[PDB]
Amino acid sequence: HHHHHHPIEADYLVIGAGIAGASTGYWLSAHGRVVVLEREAQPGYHSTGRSAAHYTVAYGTPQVRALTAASRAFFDNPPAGFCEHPLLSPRPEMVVDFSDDPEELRRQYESGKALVPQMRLLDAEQACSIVPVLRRDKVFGATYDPTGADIDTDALHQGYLRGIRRNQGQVLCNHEALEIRRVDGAWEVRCDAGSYRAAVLVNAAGAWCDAIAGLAGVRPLGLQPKRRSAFIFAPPPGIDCHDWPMLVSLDESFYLKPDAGMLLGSPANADPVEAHDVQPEQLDIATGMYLIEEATTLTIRRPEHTWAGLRSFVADGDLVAGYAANAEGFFWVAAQGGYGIQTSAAMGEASAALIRHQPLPAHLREHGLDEAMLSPRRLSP
Ligand SMILES: Cc1cc2nc3c(=O)[nH]c(=O)nc-3n(C[C@H](O)[C@H](O)[C@H](O)COP(=O)(O)OP(=O)(O)OC[C@H]3O[C@@H](n4cnc5c(N)ncnc54)[C@H](O)[C@@H]3O)c2cc1C
Ligand SMILES: N=C(Cc1cnc[nH]1)C(=O)O
Structure with a gap:
């Protein structure tokens, strides 16, 4: 009985505009319609704005160290136009x-x-x-x-978000996902002023990733x-x-x-x-x-x-990037632990590739990454 806007159609709905959603969204945005839905008035109010802003390869499990190592090339040499100053000090x-x-x-x-x-x-x-x-x-x-290096996290984060917008994606703050439902072959997210629909729901909600699964009826990761x-x-x-x-x-x-x-x-x-x-x-x-x-x-x-x-x-201390078993179109970008900034280039590129049903890019495989090591399926016997 209350007004809502006509639904908005996209290819990928990203829940959360922190480093996880922004990096994934960045690499998706050249390939299809991205809409990022963020609860807060700003994209970096939670963990991405609260870090020690440091890059350290020998930290975390072996998967973490590979993701971090594989991210350095982007950080040292990002695309022309990505940002105005060096990302690492x-x-x-x-x-x-x-x-x-x-x-x-x-x-x-x-x-x-x-x-x-x-x-x-x-x-x-x-x-x-x-x-x-x-x-x-x-x-x-x-x-x-x-x-080791210090990371200009704000420049990195804003670079990812600007990249999305330059590729005609939308980054919508004050758009908390309130309801999530699989409707007519798509995931449909209700926000307070209107709903959003896409075949892919990218769950990049930080500490709230299992809460988002709970809205959707998808088994959480723990x-x-x-x-x-x-x-x-x-x-x-x-x-x-x-x-x-x-x-x-x-x-x-x-x-x-x-x-x-x-x-x-x-x-x-x-x-x-x-x-x-x-x-x-x-x-x-x-x-x-x-x-x-x-x-x-x-x-x-x-x-x-x-x-x-x-x-x-x-439970195993590793990051998660992969489609949920038995929940078509629901993609986890989760469990960033103490490593979400320093792994973000590799996680964003990997997650985007996997969302798109593509092979992991060579430079990532060469650092010892594979789909199985990232998948939520590994948390299950
Ligand atoms: C003290 C400290 C030191 C750290 N040091 C480092 C470091 O040196 N290097 C490093 O790599 N990492 C470090 N980290 C870890 C890093 O902060 C996190 O791994 C990373 O920020 C997680 O990013 P995220 O995008 O998953 O989470 P977040 O940045 O929290 O983003 C998730 C977003 O989802 C949004 N959201 C949640 N629910 C909804 C909903 N219903 N609808 C819409 N949006 C929703 C939230 O509002 C939030 O903006 C540190 C963390 C802390 C706290
Ligand atoms: N990642 C950190 C701090 C850090 C140290 N070196 C790199 N990062 C944390 O407190 O989660």
């Missing part, structure tokens, strides 16, 4: 053993080196030379990856959102930290990285929560500050910024 990563676990440190070095030939094994004095605020008594060695908090604080007078690496503890108890002229800290937490607009917890922030003040000579007065975001995982 040099930022090596140093993983420091603060718990005296040489066997773990060696395992991570050998593992890392196998993918990153320039990775180095450092002794405690070498780690303290690189970040001189480290407490030598607390340091037992480190790994060092000279190939996605678990996990809260991670972070904060920005001023370095003490006299400390010039602008060229420090990203510093991470071996057991992921905290990390620390320069953010221009400030420092970004985090307790690197993973507290399981429901999908929601997540806020930082005081205990998260206090724990991160405590651990930084114990590992280093830094004293932290009060943060300039605090936030938290959701890193969402399925």
Whole structure:
């Protein structure tokens, strides 16, 4: 009984305009009519706007590391017109053993080196030379990856969205998917002012991917959102930290990285929560500050910024890009975990190819990617 606009027909409806939907949409948009439906007034209000903006190959499961490695070429050399400035800035990563676990440190070095030939094994004095605020008594060695990079996430994200629009796609904010139904051979999404129809529904809804499946009547993946908090604080007078690496503890108890002229800290937490607009917890922030003040000579007065975001995982820690079994046209782009920005070029290209029933492009297969490794079918016996 209330007015709605006539339905809009497309080839692919993408739910969510974060890095997952934007990257998938970007690679789809040259081939057909893309409509991206985003709940919020802005596309990057949830996880894509809350990251540490870093690129690190030796991080995550083997599938994650391949997706990340395979994304570098786009990031370093994107198409003409994609963006105005470089997407990556040099930022090596140093993983420091603060718990005296040489066997773990060696395992991570050998593992890392196998993918990153320039990775180095450092002794405690070498780690303290690189970040001189480290407490030598607390340091037992480190790994060092000279190939790490900071990512200009806003430029990357906006580049994907602009690409969609240049290919006559639509990116519609304030268009929460409220209902989803298979109607006359298409998926039909009701938003508050009108509905959208396409043969393909691309579920790129971040921590809400299983909620979208629940609207559609599609069996969910078992996605678990996990809260991670972070904060920005001023370095003490006299400390010039602008060229420090990203510093991470071996057991992921905290990390620390320069953010221009400030420092970004985090307790690197993973507290399981429901999908929601997540806020930082005081205990998260206090724990991160405590651990930084114990590992280093830094004293932290009060943060300039605090936030938290959701890193969402399925049971095996791997990303998901594939059609749902037994649910025609429903395509998952999910389980980005702590890796959705640094994997986005490979995930977007792969997902788009698979949506289109195409082979994975050579450069992706050469990095050891295949359809089965990405598929949600692997979560099932
Ligand atoms: C503290 C922290 C540090 C991190 N560090 C890094 C890092 O250094 N590098 C890295 O690669 N990753 C990092 N991550 C991970 C990265 O943030 C996520 O993997 C990535 O942002 C997930 O993108 P997404 O598109 O899946 O999710 P989101 O960006 O959350 O996008 C999903 C979108 O779906 C929309 N949506 C949900 N439901 C609906 C609906 N009903 N209708 C319409 N739209 C809907 C949401 O509003 C949202 O905009 C970090 C994350 C955190 C929190
Ligand atoms: N991905 C991160 C941080 C990161 C470190 N190096 C690259 N990324 C996270 O906190 O999920």
